[PDB]
Design an enzyme around this catalytic site. Structure first.
Site, short mmCIF file in Angstrom:
data_model
loop_
_atom_site.label_atom_id
_atom_site.label_comp_id
_atom_site.label_asym_id
_atom_site.label_seq_id
_atom_site.Cartn_x
_atom_site.Cartn_y
_atom_site.Cartn_z
N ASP A 1 -19.46 -1.15 17.45
CA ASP A 1 -20.67 -0.33 17.62
C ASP A 1 -20.37 1.00 18.01
OD1 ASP A 1 -20.65 -0.55 20.38
OD2 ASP A 1 -22.04 -2.20 20.35
N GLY B 1 -22.11 2.97 20.19
CA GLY B 1 -22.30 3.33 21.62
C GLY B 1 -23.65 4.05 21.72
N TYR C 1 -26.76 3.38 20.71
CA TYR C 1 -27.95 2.31 21.19
C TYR C 1 -27.74 2.01 22.55
CZ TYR C 1 -30.82 -1.91 21.72
OH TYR C 1 -31.63 -2.94 22.25
N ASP D 1 -25.39 7.28 16.58
CA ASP D 1 -26.43 7.32 16.33
C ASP D 1 -27.57 7.64 17.38
OD1 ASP D 1 -26.42 4.82 16.90
OD2 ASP D 1 -28.36 4.33 15.54
N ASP E 1 -25.39 -8.94 13.29
CA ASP E 1 -24.63 -9.38 14.55
C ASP E 1 -25.57 -9.66 15.41
OD1 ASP E 1 -25.16 -7.15 16.89
OD2 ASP E 1 -24.94 -6.24 14.89
N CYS F 1 -24.55 -31.25 11.73
CA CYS F 1 -23.63 -30.21 12.12
C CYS F 1 -22.15 -30.57 11.71
CB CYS F 1 -23.97 -29.46 13.35
SG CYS F 1 -22.66 -28.29 13.92
N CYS G 1 -19.41 -28.88 13.03
CA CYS G 1 -18.67 -28.38 13.88
C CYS G 1 -18.16 -29.38 14.77
CB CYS G 1 -19.51 -27.32 15.00
SG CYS G 1 -20.22 -28.24 16.34
N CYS H 1 -20.04 -31.12 17.59
CA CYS H 1 -21.14 -32.27 17.09
C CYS H 1 -20.08 -33.68 16.55
CB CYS H 1 -22.03 -31.82 16.06
SG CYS H 1 -23.12 -30.65 16.71
N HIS I 1 -20.82 -24.52 19.29
CA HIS I 1 -21.90 -25.07 18.27
C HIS I 1 -22.76 -24.12 17.86
CE1 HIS I 1 -25.11 -27.29 16.49
NE2 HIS I 1 -25.63 -26.74 17.33
C1 LIG Z 1 -31.00 -4.53 18.75
N1 LIG Z 1 -29.60 -3.79 18.70
C2 LIG Z 1 -28.35 -4.25 19.17
C3 LIG Z 1 -29.58 -2.52 18.13
C4 LIG Z 1 -30.75 -1.87 17.57
C5 LIG Z 1 -30.71 -0.86 16.97
C6 LIG Z 1 -29.61 -0.11 16.94
C7 LIG Z 1 -29.47 1.23 16.26
O1 LIG Z 1 -30.43 1.82 15.81
O2 LIG Z 1 -28.42 2.08 16.45
C8 LIG Z 1 -28.43 -0.57 17.46
N2 LIG Z 1 -28.58 -1.69 18.06
ZN LIG Z 2 -22.41 -28.51 16.15
#
Ligand SMILES: CN(C)c1ccc(C(=O)O)cn1
Ligand SMILES: [Zn+2]
Ligand SMILES: CN(C)c1ccc(C(=O)O)cn1
Ligand SMILES: CN(C)c1ccc(C(=O)O)cn1
Ligand SMILES: CN(C)c1ccc(C(=O)O)cn1
Ligand SMILES: [Zn+2]
EC number: 2.4.2.29
Lengths: 371, 371
Positions: free
Chosen positions: A92, A94, A96, A143, A267, A305, A307, A310, A336
């Site tokens: 990421d 950073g 946010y 951003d 994510d 499942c 995994c 399980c 899991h």
């Molecule tokens: C909810 N999360 C982790 C977010 C939401 C928005 C952003 C972003 O606009 O840069 C980043 N992470």
């Molecule tokens: Zn499982």
């Protein structure tokens, strides 16, 4: 191997399935990235993360720049070597996290100065450099996530700053030949809930040019209906021929609906964090394993499942572990949940490839919400 | 397969190496048993415990009778099925733990009534029954660990009560045909630091007859010199042809010296508990991985260790994990420490078999204490 090559194998409506080829491996899309905040996907060895089906994990630039530090990770050979994950990592930006996690911040056109919870500065150039030192494979442009709700005018000025920061991120990334040759750079669309601003943001990002595009500024308290509404008009504004990423999303039904609207990558901390707290995802909805009803239940967390958890352990045992505060409880719940998320993504990919995703989504929702 | 058959393959001085054959597997001696207090060896899946070389683990009767409960474990198929460990399990009697862990106790000839930290009763008959319901393979007779220091008279009366309890434990075990046919029963010698009482205790236990004999009442604050002094005269009083067990011991050098004095079996929380707290055992002595000197150390925890952790991760990474409070840090530290203990036991067994244990012990101590 290619630095970055996205191929769409099949479509159904707005949904797509395909592959991103990178030097450290292939990413099958739609993809779910387990979150490995502090250079670990919590409670899992990397081999276990891979065994669940994950192709790529996320690293948290804000955490890693503070502990252990980006220069230190680089001196130790990069994040991949440090944590023992040899496949792609997305970091990421950073932008946010600095606003979500810092005790105090000062924002300006240059970037954000902040105090750690554990004085520092992030900017487009510093974020790119930190991500370079970490050695990540997919770099996120720095951003500003517009708070929600926001006036149209504040959403506009925030978005415009983010687009200037996107251009600065692009330039800094392109200046570092090793980074530009080996990694990919994604841009983040902003504009809050406003269609005209989302369009201006998409146009600006496409004019700069990125390898992939995130729909930013969502999952910040607006709720699923509004998130889906924004996705409805926002995703079609992005280049069709590049991956579309939704950060911080989400619950299984959030993912299914976002895929229906053209998202290729996700994510979220939910499977790991909620697993540690006793929530297991199942095809019949989430369960809280600590609940007394599971104390003598010899079935696995989910009886369909695939995994390893399980195959080997009962609800009753995992109930005991979590209630006792045992680390193995967190381990088994997390393995899991991540495996469940990966199996969901596999079912999504297969159903799109086979032209039956609409039926899958309906069947999934009917069962998941029936509990 | 045999219920219980102990074979001594080789001796050197008082040290022995051999095997205990049981229905659920072979135990190579001298043996170290990882402690699986609450139906888990903390932070390790059973397959990982086995991969380190462990042949047998310990279960804590006092904890398990409270949570999840012995009847519940039996209803769920026994402790082996519940936790996913199919090899032998030794269960402690509860006689030490009840006095170590309870908020309040009342002791009598019948047994001990107590209040849990999370009102209950333990006795020879109840302890045997609980261990039966758990399905353990080696059952410990319910004893009284004499506090240290103790007057000769109080040590004598405590020991005599323990010997009456040993006979009651033997009778209760023999009354349960399935238990007597499938499990083994060990007796616990008491007598504090007094040779005459240790002799009376050994004689009483041998007259009752057990499959194995523990030297109880040690590792309770007396220190290594005094522990070794007591072992010097106590172990030769026990039947030579049965295993000798030292509970709650110990550091690597405690184990080596106890083997030199005829001990065949050990359990201790040190490798697991201290691993979680940042202490790693190495052939050059223990290290605290959180120390700043390890922040950029790319060597593994121990550069001669064969464990999976030392094949894959650096000191620097594990240092970061433990400092960050990450579960993976506990996992990796614990796997390494248990593997280290198992490699120590293997070196002990091999050196005795080869008639070079005295040289091994000297070389081990010279290096381990050189740090
Ligand atoms: C909810 N999360 C982790 C977010 C939401 C928005 C952003 C972003 O606009 O840069 C980043 N992470
Ligand atoms: Zn499982
Ligand atoms: C450019 N890099 C390596 C940076 C930038 C900023 C920081 C910080 O404020 O702590 C750390 N690393
Ligand atoms: C004989 N068994 C099954 C016992 C004995 C005593 C207790 C207790 O006091 O909680 C529990 N189980
Ligand atoms: C140090 N530990 C665990 C001990 C010591 C002594 C005993 C006993 O005499 O029954 C049991 N456990
Ligand atoms: Zn090791």
């Amino acid at each position: 191997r290619p630095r970055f090559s996205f191929s769409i194998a099949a479509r159904e409506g707005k949904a797509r399935t395909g592959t991103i080829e990178m030097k450290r491996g292939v990413i099958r899309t739609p993809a779910f990235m387990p979150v490995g905040t502090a250079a670990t996907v919590k409670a899992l060895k990397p081999e276990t993360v891979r065994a669940t089906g994950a192709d790529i994990i996320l690293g948290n630039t804000y955490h890693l720049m503070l502990r252990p530090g980006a220069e230190r990770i680089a001196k130790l050979g990069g994040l991949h070597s440090f944590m023992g994950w040899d496949r792609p990592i997305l970091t990421d930006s950073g932008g946010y996290q600095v606003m979500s996690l810092s005790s105090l911040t000062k924002q300006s056109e240059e970037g954000v100065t902040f105090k750690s919870h554990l004085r520092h500065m992030l900017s487009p150039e510093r974020s790119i450099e930190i991500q370079h030192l970490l050695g990540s494979d997919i770099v996120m442009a720095f951003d500003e996530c517009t708070p929600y709700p926001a006036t149209p005018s504040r959403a506009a000025s925030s978005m415009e700053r983010s687009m200037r920061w996107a251009k600065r991120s692009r330039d800094a990334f392109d200046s570092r030949k090793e980074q530009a040759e080996n990694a990919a750079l994604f841009g983040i669309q902003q504009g809050s809930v406003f269609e005209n601003l989302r369009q201006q943001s998409a146009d600006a990002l496409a004019e700069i040019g990125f390898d992939g595009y995130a729909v930013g500024g969502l999952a910040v308290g607006e709720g699923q209906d509004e998130m889906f509404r924004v996705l409805d008009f926002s995703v079609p504004m992005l280049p069709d021929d590049k991956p579309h990423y939704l950060m911080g999303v989400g619950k299984p039904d959030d993912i299914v609906g976002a895929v229906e609207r053209g998202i290729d990558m996700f994510d979220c901390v939910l499977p790991t964090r909620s697993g540690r707290n006793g929530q297991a995802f199942t095809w019949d909805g989430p369960i809280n394993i600590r609940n007394a009803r599971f104390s003598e239940d010899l079935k696995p967390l989910d009886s369909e499942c695939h995994c390893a958890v399980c195959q080997k352990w009962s609800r009753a045992y995992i109930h005991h572990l979590i209630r006792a505060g045992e680390i193995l409880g967190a381990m088994l719940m997390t393995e899991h949940n991540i495996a469940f998320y990966q199996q969901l993504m596999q079912k999504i990919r297969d159903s799109i490839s086979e032209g039956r995703f609409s039926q899958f989504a309906q069947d999934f929702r009917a069962r998941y919400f029936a509990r």
